[PDB]
Amino acid sequence: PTVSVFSMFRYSNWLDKLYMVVGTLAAIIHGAGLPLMMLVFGEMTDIFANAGNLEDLMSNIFMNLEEDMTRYAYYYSGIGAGVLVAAYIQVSFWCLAAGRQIHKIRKQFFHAIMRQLNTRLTDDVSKINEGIGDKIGMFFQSMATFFTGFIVGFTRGWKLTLVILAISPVLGLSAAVWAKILSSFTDKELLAYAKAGAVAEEVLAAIRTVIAFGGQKKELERYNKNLEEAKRIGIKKAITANISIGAAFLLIYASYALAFWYGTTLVLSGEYSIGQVLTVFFSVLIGAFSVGQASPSIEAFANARGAAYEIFKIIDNSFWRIMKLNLTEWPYFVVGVFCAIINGGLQPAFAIIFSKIIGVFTRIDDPETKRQNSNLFSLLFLALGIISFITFFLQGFTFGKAGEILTKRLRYMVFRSMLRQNTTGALTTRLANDAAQVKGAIGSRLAVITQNIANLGTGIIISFIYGWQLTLLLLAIVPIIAIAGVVEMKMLSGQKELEGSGKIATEAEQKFEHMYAQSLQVPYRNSLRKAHIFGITFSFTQAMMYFSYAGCFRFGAYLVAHKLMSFEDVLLVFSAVVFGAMAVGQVSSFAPDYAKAKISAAHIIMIIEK
């Protein structure tokens, strides 16, 4: 049922093999870039901490802080430029190799299907594409991140690295389950409606018989009995997916708690420094998470090898009216909006707790007081994890249940109005998709906006309180950091121009295959251009995350040295603003097209009021 790993790439020529080799080297280099970033970040933290401790000591009785921070700005910018180049080459070369091979495969498959099966020519080649393209570069980049992170961890601190080893299996498993849930989310949504979509298609295809025999009140009940099961499956999915991702968040925050309790123990015993702790922790944790994230790649490669089997065998042989739709679910919406506020407000709460536990180690104090404060802040990390688990689950569950109730109701009354009466394909799409997207204009929009406000608005407010000069500087790059998060999630998710050439294939010798070949030219060139365009977009938004470090901490060195701020405040502002922009991007990448959703709702309301 699957082809060979070597036989998968039999249409690659010398240029494609070169693209793969150089794209894999660039992937290794790109993946090695975040652990080196954490190494540099730890050294910078230690510079700041030592300066702060010495100033605290000599209070009653920062000279070189800016000079020392220029070098680290250079290191940050160098890693950022290297990552820019390497990410560009990786993404670009892997997309180009995949595109050239998929083009040759499409042409060969249509030549062979006629030298002698439409799904095998439309969707199976797309499965091969999804398998042999970006995902392989992702996989090598994530393997490099894992290995480099663990090398940096063991070289900087093996004791703390071992303590985080004890946890890394669960972290990689959480990341794997998370990424798999994200990958298969829409497929499961389409699969739940399968049994009711069959009834819908078979009734709408024989509508004359139905309204002639008067079986409207019975086909409605068949559809309803299947809609109940679709809704139950949707509720179960809303429970399990959200409980899994909430458990992942809880595990991340508990890892913070544990690693920082142990690391602060090692720092108070004099054996480690706080920058050393930061380096080890962030390196090992990000590596362990990257491993998990690299499992959709293996699933996709296996699916590509599965899809290539058949092919190669053949070849070889009003927003207020819309909201009023979902009005009876105001309890779910109240609970969900409350939970979305509490969920968004966890990024600034984390910024505060993190900056405080690190600022404990940037000024001198009694060892007993330092132990007490470190214990308190580790406990606060754990409490953050518990709260995030609960609120994430509740937000997801309430909004998903309201969305399921609304979808079932909309499908039901849409079918009832079609029966109390426009091709059958259009009607089945109105029932399968248009009814399932009206929730995107209500609950999804509400959740995304509430969470993003409670996150970035609160972050920016407390950042203006703690350090307004740095907040003003970082506000200029907030849009690019948010877009970086959006682009990164779109790149991980792997997210029409072939429909024109689907006609020449659906119709069907040499002339037909020549017409098909000529029809493929425009989408071929479009994909070859999109490869470069997306490579450069991704690489630039990735490098901006590295340049944010340089800018923020050079200006923070200036401010700390001139006494306008402390390193704890610089850390708080960095965390809050920068990673709240990143979280805003990551959350907004789950919001559906509000325009398409309003259009779907308009069509649904037309059909219902007809």
Epitope: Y272, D365, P367
Partner: antibody, heavy 122, light 111 residues
Framework: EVQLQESGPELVKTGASVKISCKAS????????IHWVKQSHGKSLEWIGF????????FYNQKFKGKATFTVDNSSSTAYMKFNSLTFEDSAVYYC???????????????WGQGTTVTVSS | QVVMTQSPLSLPVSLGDQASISCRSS???????????LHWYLQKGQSPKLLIY???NRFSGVPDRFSGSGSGTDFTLKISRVEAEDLGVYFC????????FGGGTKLDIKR
Amino acid sequence: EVQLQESGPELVKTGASVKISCKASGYSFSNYYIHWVKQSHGKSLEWIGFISCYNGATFYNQKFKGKATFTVDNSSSTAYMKFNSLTFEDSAVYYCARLPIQFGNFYPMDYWGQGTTVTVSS
Amino acid sequence: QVVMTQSPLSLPVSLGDQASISCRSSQSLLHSNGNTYLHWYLQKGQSPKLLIYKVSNRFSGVPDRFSGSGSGTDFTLKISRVEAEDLGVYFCSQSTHIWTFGGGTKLDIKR
């Protein structure tokens, strides 16, 4: 074990210079200051200053500024104190002690060197 | 500069008996954070060893014979049973206002 091995006894000519060392072993060198303390015969100990074993930032007692100079070799984990224009009043025993950087003066000098006697004679 | 004064410059003791060494600062050693940073070291051509720190906390690996008390500008180090590995020079150290040390007290065998 934490150990601070100091160099050996030194007999110096008046007006010359001598550099004495404190080799640390058994702990993370760069998380501590090395303080230098002087003891003349029949007098109380006297703090000279300290140097940071992380970046080499020094602080000198006002009586000793210009008279002594602290340096640090982070590779060998040693601290040095050098005198200039030694006079007879510098005949004394010199100790090194370590202090955690994280706690500053909110902690004792827990480990000391064994002392280096310096006899300035012409 | 805080001046630290040790009352007995020499303390004749007897093996097995008790000993008490006093220290007095020219200014209160209580810090604004509620702690008093007074430490006691023993010196024998060896390195000084920390015995007591922060008035009364015994250092790691120090026998139970050594105990410390005192409040402000008046502190004491008591040795409950003077063994033979205790004859040396005990000196106090403050680190509240900053480093200054006490003059030292030599334990001598009484006869």
